[PDB]
Amino acid sequence: SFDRPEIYSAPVLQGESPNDDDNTEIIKSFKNFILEFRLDSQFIYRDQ
Amino acid sequence: NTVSLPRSCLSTIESESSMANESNIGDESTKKNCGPDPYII
Amino acid sequence: NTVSLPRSCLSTIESESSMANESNIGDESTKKNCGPDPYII
Amino acid sequence: PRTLTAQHLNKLVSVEGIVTKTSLVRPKLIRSVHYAAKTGRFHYRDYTDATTTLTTRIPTPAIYPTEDTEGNKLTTEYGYSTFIDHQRITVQEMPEMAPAGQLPRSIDVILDDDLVDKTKPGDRVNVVGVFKSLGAGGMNQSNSNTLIGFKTLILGNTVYPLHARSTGVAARQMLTDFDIRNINKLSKKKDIFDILSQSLA
């Protein structure tokens, strides 16, 4: 009578050079667009 | 976020614990078979 | 006096009574299916 | 064991014989208890099998729980669970009664809880119990094989050791107050040693 084993991870090293058309880079670019894009000197999307 | 409920019980493929293997068998030689579409919401 | 237990529940083919046909359906559209080898001695 | 036939099934019987081999006393799981870390609650579950009840019942094969209803992980409490003992023995017809030049007959017996270690191999034993049949004799599914029949055994509920000559079981008699009075009276005479000596053979 035992319980279930677990699984987990942690980052240590740097993998291969990231390609442009991959989901993580797409997400990063979208996040940058949300948090940085300026119109009339305003952070419209962050504010809204 | 066409999803369907599992067709068969997942407790077999999911070997959660060592005692689960015992629980998955009992009453002599009769194999455990939950039947088709055994899940309820 | 190689007989084997029935493979499927016989209450369907055995239309014993009028109310048995009603009892053979319930909980909306789900069809009744006892499963394979549902009999115990 | 030789004169025990199918016509006695499901009926209370009393068998006599010699124990030929016992089994290792193992614990059986009955109720399991678990603790939830994310909520601080204690859950439990119960288990059962075919041999714990005389009347047939519809199986309820509950699984061993590892998660909470909400998805939280679970921790087991071995000290708060419950276990029960279980032993299996084999009984054979006595050699002072079995047919000579003929192989012997034997029957299995299952003991539980407080009747688990009351005998050892080589004893003469009298067991009173229920002669039962279990499972399905290959009837379910196709099971083209027809040679095998129904499994049978005794749900033993009374066990008695019997003394016999040239056997490892000692003889013991219960002493009554009349016996004690008589023996104590007899002890006080002066020729008791002579009387006892002459009593022999």
UniProtKB/Swiss-Prot annotation, chains B, C:
Taxonomy, superkingdom: Eukaryota
Location within or outside the cell: Nucleus
Protein name in UniProt: Minichromosome maintenance protein 5
Lineage: Eukaryota, Fungi, Dikarya, Ascomycota, Saccharomycotina
Any further remark recorded for this protein: Present with 10300 molecules/cell in log phase SD medium. Early fractionation of eukaryotic MCM proteins yielded a variety of dimeric, trimeric and tetrameric complexes with unclear biological significance. The MCM2-7 hexamer is the proposed physiological active complex.
Family: Belongs to the MCM family.
Function text: Acts as a component of the MCM2-7 complex (MCM complex) which is the putative replicative helicase essential for 'once per cell cycle' DNA replication initiation and elongation in eukaryotic cells. The active ATPase sites in the MCM2-7 ring are formed through the interaction surfaces of two neighboring subunits such that a critical structure of a conserved arginine finger motif is provided in trans relative to the ATP-binding site of the Walker A box of the adjacent subunit.
Subunit structure comment from the entry: Component of the MCM2-7 complex. The complex forms a toroidal hexameric ring with the proposed subunit order MCM2-MCM6-MCM4-MCM7-MCM3-MCM5; loaded onto DNA, forms a head-head double hexamer. Interacts with CSM1.
UniProtKB/Swiss-Prot annotation, chain D:
UniProt keyword annotations, A-Z: ATP-binding, DNA replication, DNA-binding, Helicase, Hydrolase, Nucleotide-binding, Nucleus, Phosphoprotein
Subunit and partners: Component of the MCM2-7 complex. The complex forms a toroidal hexameric ring with the proposed subunit order MCM2-MCM6-MCM4-MCM7-MCM3-MCM5; loaded onto DNA, forms a head-head double hexamer. Interacts with CSM1.
Family, as annotated: Belongs to the MCM family.
Gene: MCM3
Predominant location category: nucleus
Domain of life per record: Eukaryota
Organism in which the protein naturally occurs: Saccharomyces cerevisiae (strain ATCC 204508 / S288c)
Miscellaneous section: Present with 35100 molecules/cell in log phase SD medium. Early fractionation of eukaryotic MCM proteins yielded a variety of dimeric, trimeric and tetrameric complexes with unclear biological significance. The MCM2-7 hexamer is the proposed physiological active complex.
Entry protein name: DNA replication licensing factor MCM3
Function: Acts as a component of the MCM2-7 complex (MCM complex) which is the putative replicative helicase essential for 'once per cell cycle' DNA replication initiation and elongation in eukaryotic cells. The active ATPase sites in the MCM2-7 ring are formed through the interaction surfaces of two neighboring subunits such that a critical structure of a conserved arginine finger motif is provided in trans relative to the ATP-binding site of the Walker A box of the adjacent subunit. The six ATPase active sites, however, are likely to contribute differentially to the complex helicase activity.
UniProt signal peptide: none
Parent-protein start and end of this portion: 168 to 368 of 971
Subcellular location per the Swiss-Prot or TrEMBL entry: Nucleus
UniProt keyword rRNA processing present: no
